[PDB]
Amino acid sequence: TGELFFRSGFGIGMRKDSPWKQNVSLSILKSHENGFMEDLDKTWVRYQEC
Amino acid sequence: GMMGELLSGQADMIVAPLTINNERAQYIEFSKPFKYQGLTILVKKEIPR
Amino acid sequence: QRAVMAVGSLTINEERSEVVDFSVPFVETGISVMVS
Amino acid sequence: YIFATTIALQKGSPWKRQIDLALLQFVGDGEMEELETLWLTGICHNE
């Protein structure tokens, strides 16, 4: 019921000296633009109704 | 938990649905996030008459 | 470098990220479809 | 239903951390929803 509250995002946790920022972010935007987000939205999220 | 296990050296990767916060970002940086979500409210279906 | 900062309602994308860095995303968007 | 889902800083700027902490505070203190009330809704959310 209702609207959302404290609208934020779910993401990856990494250390500041961890050099795995940028290429990981590249892969992430690839996942956002290539429908893999929608792929998981089908394969795990959108099936079920009462 | 998770944050102390990163800052303790025992854990090295968080890949799990964490929210984004000030104080968490003060020490451990996020990437750009997967899903843009938040809070909803569980209210039951009351039984019919 | 005519300007250091640029705000807009700027969409956040690959080729944009290739060149420049980004804030934690300000507001939420994507592709929608408008119909009657 | 949102399909093809999901601030410009030059690289190497010292400005990431400060602005991020700022914006996560502004998210964290509900003034974003005040902005929403100022600018977002017209008639449709009052369906």
Short mmCIF file of C-alpha atoms in Angstrom, two decimals:
data_model
loop_
_atom_site.label_atom_id
_atom_site.label_comp_id
_atom_site.label_asym_id
_atom_site.label_seq_id
_atom_site.Cartn_x
_atom_site.Cartn_y
_atom_site.Cartn_z
CA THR A 1 0.00 0.00 0.00
CA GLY A 2 1.03 3.57 -0.73
CA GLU A 3 3.93 5.22 -2.48
CA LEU A 4 7.61 4.49 -2.14
CA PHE A 5 9.74 5.90 0.66
CA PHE A 6 13.41 6.87 0.74
CA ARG A 7 13.83 6.06 -2.93
CA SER A 8 17.28 4.63 -3.53
CA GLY A 9 19.16 1.93 -5.39
CA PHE A 10 20.57 -1.54 -4.86
CA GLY A 11 24.18 -1.91 -5.93
CA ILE A 12 27.60 -3.40 -5.36
CA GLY A 13 29.85 -2.83 -2.33
CA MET A 14 33.55 -2.19 -2.98
CA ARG A 15 36.51 -0.71 -1.12
CA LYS A 16 37.92 2.65 -2.09
CA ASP A 17 41.37 1.35 -3.04
CA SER A 18 39.77 -1.53 -4.88
CA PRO A 19 40.59 -0.87 -8.56
CA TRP A 20 37.46 -2.66 -9.71
CA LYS A 21 35.27 0.41 -10.09
CA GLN A 22 35.28 1.36 -13.68
CA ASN A 23 35.18 -1.79 -15.79
CA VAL A 24 32.53 -3.15 -13.42
CA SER A 25 30.47 -0.01 -13.97
CA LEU A 26 30.93 -0.45 -17.72
CA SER A 27 29.54 -3.97 -17.51
CA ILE A 28 26.67 -2.66 -15.41
CA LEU A 29 25.59 -0.08 -17.97
CA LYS A 30 25.92 -2.80 -20.61
CA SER A 31 23.50 -4.86 -18.54
CA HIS A 32 21.13 -1.91 -18.29
CA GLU A 33 21.11 -1.22 -21.99
CA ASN A 34 21.17 -4.80 -23.32
CA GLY A 35 17.97 -5.94 -21.62
CA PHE A 36 19.64 -8.24 -19.09
CA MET A 37 17.83 -6.25 -16.43
CA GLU A 38 14.64 -7.14 -18.29
CA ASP A 39 15.99 -10.68 -18.62
CA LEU A 40 16.11 -11.07 -14.87
CA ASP A 41 12.78 -9.26 -14.58
CA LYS A 42 11.28 -11.99 -16.68
CA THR A 43 13.23 -14.99 -15.40
CA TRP A 44 12.81 -14.26 -11.70
CA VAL A 45 10.54 -11.27 -11.14
CA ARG A 46 7.51 -11.29 -13.42
CA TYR A 47 5.67 -14.60 -13.36
CA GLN A 48 3.29 -14.76 -10.49
CA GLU A 49 -0.25 -13.59 -9.79
CA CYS A 50 -3.08 -14.34 -7.38
CA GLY B 1 27.80 -7.52 9.57
CA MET B 2 28.66 -6.89 5.93
CA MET B 3 30.36 -3.54 6.40
CA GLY B 4 32.62 -4.73 9.18
CA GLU B 5 33.40 -7.85 7.20
CA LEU B 6 34.68 -5.68 4.39
CA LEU B 7 36.55 -3.42 6.77
CA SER B 8 37.99 -6.43 8.59
CA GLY B 9 39.61 -8.06 5.56
CA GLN B 10 37.60 -11.26 6.03
CA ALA B 11 35.18 -10.31 3.27
CA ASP B 12 36.11 -8.65 0.01
CA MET B 13 32.96 -8.47 -2.15
CA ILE B 14 29.46 -7.27 -1.41
CA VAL B 15 27.15 -8.41 -4.18
CA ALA B 16 23.81 -8.32 -2.36
CA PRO B 17 20.77 -6.03 -2.18
CA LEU B 18 22.04 -3.20 0.02
CA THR B 19 20.46 0.22 0.12
CA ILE B 20 22.47 3.38 -0.45
CA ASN B 21 23.34 5.54 2.56
CA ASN B 22 25.46 8.49 3.59
CA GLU B 23 27.50 6.77 6.25
CA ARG B 24 28.01 3.61 4.27
CA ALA B 25 29.27 5.71 1.37
CA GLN B 26 31.58 7.52 3.77
CA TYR B 27 33.79 4.44 3.90
CA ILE B 28 32.68 1.95 1.24
CA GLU B 29 31.78 3.16 -2.21
CA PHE B 30 28.85 2.09 -4.35
CA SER B 31 28.70 1.49 -8.03
CA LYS B 32 25.80 2.67 -10.07
CA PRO B 33 22.87 0.63 -8.84
CA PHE B 34 20.80 -2.27 -10.21
CA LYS B 35 17.24 -1.54 -9.19
CA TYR B 36 15.63 1.71 -8.18
CA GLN B 37 13.36 0.76 -5.34
CA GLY B 38 12.51 1.59 -1.78
CA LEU B 39 9.90 1.03 0.85
CA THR B 40 6.40 -0.34 0.65
CA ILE B 41 3.84 -1.22 3.28
CA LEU B 42 2.58 -4.72 4.05
CA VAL B 43 -1.16 -4.56 4.72
CA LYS B 44 -3.16 -7.77 4.73
CA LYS B 45 -6.19 -8.73 2.77
CA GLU B 46 -8.82 -8.80 5.50
CA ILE B 47 -11.12 -11.83 5.30
CA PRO B 48 -14.36 -11.39 3.39
CA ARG B 49 -17.71 -11.22 5.19
CA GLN C 1 36.58 22.60 -20.72
CA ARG C 2 34.37 25.56 -21.50
CA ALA C 3 32.63 24.46 -18.31
CA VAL C 4 33.51 22.17 -15.45
CA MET C 5 29.99 21.24 -14.39
CA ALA C 6 26.87 20.28 -16.30
CA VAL C 7 23.60 19.32 -14.67
CA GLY C 8 20.62 18.88 -17.03
CA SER C 9 18.18 16.03 -16.70
CA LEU C 10 21.10 14.11 -18.16
CA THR C 11 20.56 10.45 -18.97
CA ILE C 12 23.36 8.18 -17.81
CA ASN C 13 24.72 5.92 -20.52
CA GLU C 14 27.74 4.01 -21.74
CA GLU C 15 29.36 6.41 -24.20
CA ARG C 16 28.63 9.19 -21.77
CA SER C 17 30.34 7.21 -19.03
CA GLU C 18 33.27 6.49 -21.23
CA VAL C 19 34.33 10.03 -21.11
CA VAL C 20 33.08 11.38 -17.89
CA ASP C 21 32.44 10.51 -14.34
CA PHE C 22 29.02 10.65 -12.65
CA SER C 23 27.22 11.40 -9.49
CA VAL C 24 25.05 8.94 -7.84
CA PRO C 25 22.02 9.17 -10.09
CA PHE C 26 19.73 11.92 -9.24
CA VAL C 27 16.38 10.70 -10.38
CA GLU C 28 14.99 7.67 -11.99
CA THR C 29 14.32 7.19 -15.68
CA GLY C 30 14.43 4.69 -18.56
CA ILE C 31 12.29 4.14 -21.66
CA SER C 32 8.52 4.46 -21.45
CA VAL C 33 5.70 4.48 -23.99
CA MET C 34 3.03 7.19 -24.13
CA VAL C 35 -0.35 6.33 -25.69
CA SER C 36 -3.98 7.58 -25.52
CA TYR D 1 6.27 0.07 -16.50
CA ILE D 2 9.74 1.29 -17.30
CA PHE D 3 11.79 -0.03 -20.16
CA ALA D 4 15.38 0.87 -20.95
CA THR D 5 15.53 1.72 -17.26
CA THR D 6 17.75 3.67 -14.79
CA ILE D 7 25.51 14.82 -12.88
CA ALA D 8 28.43 15.55 -15.18
CA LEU D 9 31.84 15.60 -13.53
CA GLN D 10 35.09 15.77 -15.40
CA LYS D 11 37.47 12.91 -14.69
CA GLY D 12 39.95 13.40 -11.89
CA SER D 13 37.91 16.15 -10.29
CA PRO D 14 37.99 16.29 -6.48
CA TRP D 15 34.24 16.78 -6.52
CA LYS D 16 32.76 13.26 -6.50
CA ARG D 17 32.78 12.48 -2.79
CA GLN D 18 31.46 15.80 -1.53
CA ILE D 19 28.54 16.06 -3.96
CA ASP D 20 27.65 12.40 -3.41
CA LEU D 21 27.56 12.79 0.38
CA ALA D 22 25.43 15.89 -0.14
CA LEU D 23 22.92 14.26 -2.46
CA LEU D 24 22.61 11.18 -0.31
CA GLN D 25 21.81 13.46 2.60
CA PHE D 26 19.15 15.23 0.53
CA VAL D 27 17.68 11.88 -0.39
CA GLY D 28 17.98 10.83 3.22
CA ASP D 29 16.06 13.76 4.64
CA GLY D 30 12.91 13.81 2.53
CA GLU D 31 13.42 17.17 0.85
CA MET D 32 13.37 15.26 -2.42
CA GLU D 33 9.69 14.59 -1.76
CA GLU D 34 9.18 18.30 -1.13
CA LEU D 35 10.70 18.82 -4.58
CA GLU D 36 8.28 16.18 -5.86
CA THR D 37 5.33 18.08 -4.44
CA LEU D 38 6.65 21.29 -5.95
CA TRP D 39 7.19 20.02 -9.44
CA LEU D 40 6.04 16.50 -10.31
CA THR D 41 2.35 15.81 -10.09
CA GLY D 42 -0.45 17.22 -12.20
CA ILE D 43 -3.80 15.49 -12.44
CA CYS D 44 -2.88 11.85 -13.15
CA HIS D 45 -1.68 10.80 -9.70
CA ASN D 46 -4.97 12.25 -8.46
CA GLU D 47 -6.61 9.73 -10.86
#
